[PDB]
Design a protein around this ligand. Structure first.
Ligand SMILES: O=C(CC1CCCC1)N[C@@H](C(=O)NO)c1ccc(-c2cc(F)c(F)c(F)c2)cc1
Ligand SMILES: [Mg+2]
Ligand SMILES: [Mg+2]
Ligand SMILES: [Mg+2]
Ligand SMILES: [Zn+2]
Length: 889
C-alpha cells in the first residue's frame, strides 16, 4: 500500500497542454479515445513516462501516431501505464490511446458510471484515471476538447465542460456533441453527462460586467417539478458572491444535474455541477423541511467553488482544506445571510462539537492538512471540511469584515488561474493583518499551526473582580492533549470573542472585543467595570475548542436568559445539561456497579427548568432556539466527556433528565404545540416553490420536538394529536407522526399510511426509510429485517443503504445492545457494500469511530466485528486502511 507524504511533493517531469477526448457510449461498453498534447518539463530527468489508468482495457496506444507494442515499449498493470523512457520523446509530442470502460457495471460510482438511465462521471479526487490515461493530479492543468456520442433516443442531452461548439447526427440513430473548454483546469474538474434530461432554466445578469449567464437545472423527467428551489438557490448564490465578495461568474452557462446514485452531496465540475438528487430536488408535497436548507447549502457550496477550488485550485491533495474548508466557510456566510435564523450557525457548531470532536479524539485524528494518506476516497472528512471551515472563519473573526474582505481579494487576485497551497491563503490573510494592526512586523506564522496540529484545544478560565478598583480580570489557559501526530502540542492563535454582562440589568458592559490568546496562558484585564460581570465567552463559537467556562449554574442561567449572543446562550444551556448528565450518569453507574437495592439521583436544577419555561413562554423568542434548549446535548457530544461510556447507563441518565423536566413543563409543551399550529402549518404558500420561510420551518421543528417529548411522556390523550398530525400535508409533520407513534399501538397503522404516501417518490421513500430506521421501537431489529425484505432488497443505491441503516446506529439503547447484535448487523452491511462501493462501505463504518470510548464489554464487541471485517479476503483498499487506522493496528 503506497503512502503519499505531504513533504514529498515534487512537480512532474511532464506537461499535458491539451486533452482531446472522444467518448463513444454504446449499449454494453464505452470507448474512450484520447489525444494528449504533451511536453517535457524543466524538472524532467529522463524518467519513464508513467500514466495513471485504473481498470482500462487497452485497444491501442501511440506516441506521435506510431502504435506502441506491449512488453517492448510499455507495460500496463491495471493501475499504471509505463512507457519506457527510451521511447519517450525529448520535445513536444502527442500521446494517444483508445480504451474500453463499462459504466453500466461501475457500481462504485467513481469514474464514468450509469445512475438509473443517466451516464455521469465523478472524477474527484483520482477518478479521471478510471476514464482514460492521465497524470492524475491537480497540478497537471490542461485545455479540454471533448466530444461525446451516444444513442439519440436514450441519451438526447449531452453535456461536458465549456462551450458546446458542435452538434451532429451519426448513422444508426446516434448523435454527438463537441465541447471546447479553453481555460486550464485540473482533470478532477472534468465531467460528462448523457441522458434523457428535462430542465428548468433562467438568465442571470452579472452585477458589474452585465454578462448574461444561462442557468440550467436538470433531472430525469419524473422529477422535473422538483427543480424550482435549486434554481432559486443558484440565483441567490451568485448574488451573494457578487454582494459580499465582489465576485462574478465568468462563463456563459452553468448546468446543475441531479442523479439518483451519488457517493456524497455534490461535485463542483466547472460549469457542470453534479448533485445527489437528495441535495438538489425538493417539493413541498414530497420533501421534508430539511431539504430546503440542504439544497441551499449544497447549491451554494458548489457555486462558491467556482472561485475557491476551480479558478484558484490545489497544488496537491494535501491542500484539500484550502478549497473545502474555505468553501464551507463561504457557504456558511451565505446561508446565515439567507436564512436570517440563529439556528443556522448553531446547527454547524452542533455538528462540529459532536461529529468532528469525536473524530479528533479518535484514533483517526488528523490535522486539517494531513501529512500522509493512502486512500483519497477516505480523505474527505469532517475534520478537513468542518474544522477547516472554522479555521477559515477565525480569519474573519480576527480581521473583521472590512479587512477580511481585503485579504480575501488579495488571495483571489494573486492566485486566480493557478494552483495554490494553504500558505498562499495565510499569506494573503497576513497582509490584511499587517494593515489592520498598522504594523508591517505583525505576522500570522503561529496561525499555521491550525493547519498542522491535530486535536481539539481545551480553553479554561478563572476570574477576578476587585470592587474597589472596578477592575475585572479573565485568566485564560489553553491545552491540547498529545496524540499520535504530535507528542508536544504548541499554543495556538485562539481568538476569543467576549462580552461582559451586567447581572443586574443584562446589559453589555464593554464594546465588541476579541481577545487574541497566543500563549499557553494570558490574563486579560478590564478597567472601569462598575460591577462584577458575568463573562460571555467565545461569542458565535469563535474558535473550535472545548470551552470550560468555570461558571456556576446560576451564572449560566443568567446568560441563557439575558445574554445577547445566541451561541453563548445555547452553550450555557449545554453546560448546565452536561453537569447534570455527568452527575446522574455517575450515580446510575454506581448503582449498577454496586448492585444497589436503593439509591438517590440528584434532581435537575429547578431554576434551570424555570428558565426553560421563561424562554418557551416568551413570544418574542425564536422557535428554532427554543427547540435546542428543550433537547439534551447530542450523544456524540456527551461521549467526549465520559471514559468507558456505558451506553445503557447514559440512556437511563437521559431518560431521567427528560422525565424530570417534562414532569414540570409538559403542560407548557402541550399548550405551545397547540398554539404554534396556525403559523407553523400555514398552507398559504404550499404550492409556491419559490417561497421558503425558514422561521416557519423552525416553528415546525419546535412543534415536532415538543410532540416527541409529549409522546415519550405518554401525555394524556396525546395520541389524538399524533393521529391528526398524520393528516398534515407537510412531510415533516406526517413523518414525525410515524416516529412519535412508536410509543403507541398505532405505529404499524401509521407505518402503512406513511409508506403509501412515500412509495412513489424516490427521495420521499428514502426519508420514510430514515424515519422507520430511527423509530424508538423495541422490535426495531425485526422492523429492519422487514425493510430489508420488502423495500431495500439488494439495492446498490447509496441513498437507500444509508437511509435504512445509519439512523438506527444512533439508537443508543438498541444499536448498542450488549449482545453485540447491532455491531454484527452493521458489519455485515459494511462487508456486503464493500464488494461494490468501498467509499460508501467506509461511510457505513461511522458508528465504530467511538469504539474505544465505550465500556470495556462494548469495546471488545466492536473490536471483534472490526477484526472480522479486516479478515475478509476480498476487503477493499479503502476499508482495510480505514479499519487499520481506526483499530490502532
Ligand atoms: O458533498 C459533500 C458534502 C456536502 C458539501 C456541502 C454540504 C456538505 N462534499 C463534496 C464537495 O466538497 N463538493 O464540493 C464532495 C465531493 C466529492 C467527493 C469525492 C467523491 C468521490 F466519488 C471520491 F472518490 C472522492 F475521493 C471524493 C467528496 C466530497
Ligand atoms: Mg475496466
Ligand atoms: Mg444583485
Ligand atoms: Mg431507486
Ligand atoms: Zn466542496
Amino acid at each position: 500500500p503506497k503512502i503519499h507524504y505531504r513533504k514529498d511533493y515534487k512537480p512532474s517531469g511532464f506537461i499535458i497542454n491539451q486533452v482531446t477526448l472522444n467518448i463513444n457510449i454504446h449499449d454494453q461498453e464505452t470507448i474512450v479515445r484520447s489525444v494528449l498534447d504533451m511536453d517535457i518539463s524543466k524538472h524532467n530527468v529522463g524518467e519513464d513516462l508513467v500514466f495513471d489508468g485504473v481498470g482500462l482495457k487497452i485497444n491501442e496506444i501511440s506516441i506521435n501516431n506510431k502504435k506502441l507494442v506491449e512488453g517492448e515499449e510499455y507495460t500496463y498493470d491495471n493501475e499504471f501505464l509505463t512507457i519506457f523512457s527510451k521511447f519517450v520523446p525529448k520535445s513536444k509530442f502527442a500521446f494517444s490511446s483508445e480504451v474500453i470502460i463499462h459504466p453500466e457495471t461501475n457500481y462504485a460510482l467513481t469514474g464514468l458510471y450509469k445512475s438509473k438511465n443517466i451516464i455521469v462521471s465523478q472524477c474527484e479526487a483520482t477518478g479521471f484515471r478510471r476514464i482514460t490515461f492521465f497524470i492524475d493530479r491537480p497540478d497537471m492543468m490542461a485545455k479540454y476538447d471533448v466530444t461525446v456520442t451516444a444513442d439519440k433516443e436514450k441519451y438526447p442531452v449531452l453535456l461536458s465542460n465549456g462551450d458546446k461548439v458542435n452538434e451532429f447526427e451519426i448513422p444508426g440513430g446516434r448523435h454527438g456533441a463537441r465541447f471546447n473548454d479553453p481555460p486550464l483546469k485540473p482533470c478532477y474538474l472534468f465531467a460528462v453527462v448523457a441522458g434523457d434530461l428535462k430542465h428548468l432554466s433562467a438568465t442571470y445578469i452579472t452585477k458589474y460586467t452585465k454578462k448574461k449567464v444561462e442557468l440550467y437545472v436538470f433531472s430525469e423527467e419524473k422529477y422535473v417539478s422538483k427543480l424550482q428551489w435549486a434554481l432559486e438557490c443558484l440565483k441567490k448564490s451568485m448574488a451573494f458572491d457578487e454582494d459580499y465578495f465582489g465576485l462574478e461568474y465568468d462563463l456563459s452557462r452553468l448546468n446543475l444535474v441531479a442523479v439518483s446514485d451519488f457517493n456524497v452531496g455534490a461535485m463542483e465540475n466547472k460549469g457542470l455541477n453534479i448533485f445527489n438528487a437528495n441535495s438538489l430536488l425538493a417539493s413541498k408535497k414530497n420533501s421534508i423541511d430539511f431539504s430546503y436548507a440542504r439544497i441551499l447549502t449544497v447549491v451554494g457550496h458548489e457555486y462558491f467553488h467556482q472561485y475557491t477550488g476551480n479558478r484558484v485550485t490545489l497544488r496537491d491533495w494535501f491542500q484539500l482544506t484550502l478549497k473545502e474548508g474555505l468553501t464551507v466557510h463561504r457557504e456558511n456566510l451565505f446561508s446565515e445571510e439567507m436564512t436570517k435564523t440563529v439556528t443556522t450557525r448553531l446547527s454547524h457548531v452542533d455538528l462540529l462539537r459532536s461529529v468532528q470532536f469525536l473524530e479528533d479524539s479518535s484514533p483517526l485524528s488528523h490535522p486539517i492538512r494531513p501529512e500522509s494518506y493512502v486512500s483519497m476516497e477516505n480523505f474527505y472528512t469532517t475534520t478537513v471540511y468542518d474544522k477547516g471551515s472554522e479555521v477559515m472563519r477565525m480569519y474573519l473573526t480576527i480581521l473583521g469584515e472590512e479587512y477580511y474582505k481585503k485579504g480575501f481579494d488579495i488571495y483571489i487576485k494573486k492566485n486566480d488561474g493557478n494552483t495554490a497551497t494553504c500558505e498562499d491563503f495565510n499569506y494573503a490573510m497576513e497582509q490584511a493583518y499587517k494593515m489592520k494592526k498598522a504594523d508591517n512586523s505583525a505576522n500570522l506564522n503561529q496561525y499555521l499551526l491550525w493547519f498542522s496540529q491535530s486535536g481539539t484545544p481545551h480553553v479554561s478560565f478563572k476570574y477576578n473582580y476587585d470592587a474597589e478598583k472596578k477592575q475585572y480580570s479573565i485568566h485564560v489557559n489553553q491545552y491540547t492533549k498529545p496524540d499520535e501526530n504530535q507528542k508536544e502540542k504548541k499554543p495556538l492563535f485562539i481568538p476569543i470573542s467576549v462580552g461582559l454582562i451586567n447581572p443586574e440589568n443584562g446589559k453589555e458592559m464593554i464594546s465588541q472585543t476579541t481577545l487574541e490568546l497566543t500563549k499557553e496562558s494570558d490574563t486579560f484585564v478590564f478597567n472601569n467595570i462598575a460591577v462584577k460581570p458575568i463573562p460571555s465567552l467565545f461569542r458565535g463559537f469563535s474558535a473550535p475548542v472545548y470551552i470550560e467556562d468555570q461558571l456556576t449554574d446560576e451564572e449560566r442561567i443568567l446568560l441563557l436568559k439575558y445574554d445577547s449572543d445566541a451561541f453563548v446562550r445555547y452553550n450555557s444551556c449545554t453546560n448546565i445539561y452536561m453537569k447534570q448528565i455527568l452527575m446522574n450518569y455517575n450515580e446510575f453507574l454506581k448503582a449498577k456497579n454496586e448492585k444497589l437495592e436503593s439509591f438517590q439521583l440528584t434532581p435537575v436544577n429547578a431554576q434551570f427548568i424555570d428558565a426553560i419555561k421563561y424562554l418557551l413562554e416568551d413570544p418574542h423568542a425564536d422557535a428554532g432556539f427554543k427547540s435546542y434548549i428543550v433537547s439534551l446535548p447530542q450523544d456524540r457530544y456527551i461521549i467526549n466527556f465520559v471514559s468507558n461510556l456505558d451506553t445503557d447507563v447514559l440512556a437511563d441518565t437521559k431518560e431521567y433528565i427528560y422525565k424530570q423536566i417534562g414532569d414540570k413543563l409538559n403542560d407548557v409543551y402541550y399548550k405551545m404545540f397547540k398554539s404554534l399550529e396556525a403559523k407553523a402549518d400555514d398552507l398559504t404558500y404550499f404550492n409556491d416553490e419559490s417561497h421558503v420561510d425558514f422561521d416557519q420551518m423552525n416553528m415546525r421543528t419546535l412543534r415536532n420536538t415538543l410532540l416527541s417529548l409529549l409522546s415519550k411522556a405518554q401525555y394524556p390523550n396525546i395520541l389524538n394529536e399524533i393521529i391528526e398530525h398524520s393528516k398534515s400535508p407537510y412531510p415533516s409533520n406526517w413523518l414525525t407522526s410515524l416516529s412519535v407513534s412508536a410509543y403507541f399501538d398505532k405505529y404499524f397503522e401509521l407505518y402503512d399510511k406513511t409508506y403509501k404516501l412515500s412509495k412513489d417518490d424516490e427521495l420521499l421513500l428514502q426519508e420514510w426509510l430514515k424515519t422507520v430506521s430511527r423509530s424508538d421501537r423495541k422490535d426495531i431489529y425485526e422492523i429492519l429485517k422487514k425493510l430489508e425484505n420488502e423495500v431495500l432488497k439488494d439495492s446498490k443505491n447509496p441513498n437507500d443503504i444509508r437511509a435504512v441503516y445509519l439512523p438506527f446506529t444512533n439508537n443508543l439503547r438498541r444499536f448498542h445492545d450488549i449482545s453485540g447484535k447491532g455491531y454484527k448487523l452493521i458489519a455485515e452491511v459494511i462487508t456486503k457494500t464493500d464488494k461494490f462501493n468501498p467509499m460508501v462501505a467506509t461511510q457505513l463504518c461511522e458508528p465504530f469511530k467511538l469504539w474505544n470510548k465505550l465500556d470495556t464489554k462494548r469495546q471488545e464487541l466492536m473490536l471483534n466485528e472490526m477484526n472480522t471485517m479486516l479478515q475478509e479476503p476480498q476487503i477493499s483498499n479503502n476499508l482495510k486502511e480505514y479499519l487499520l487506522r481506526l483499530t490502532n493496528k
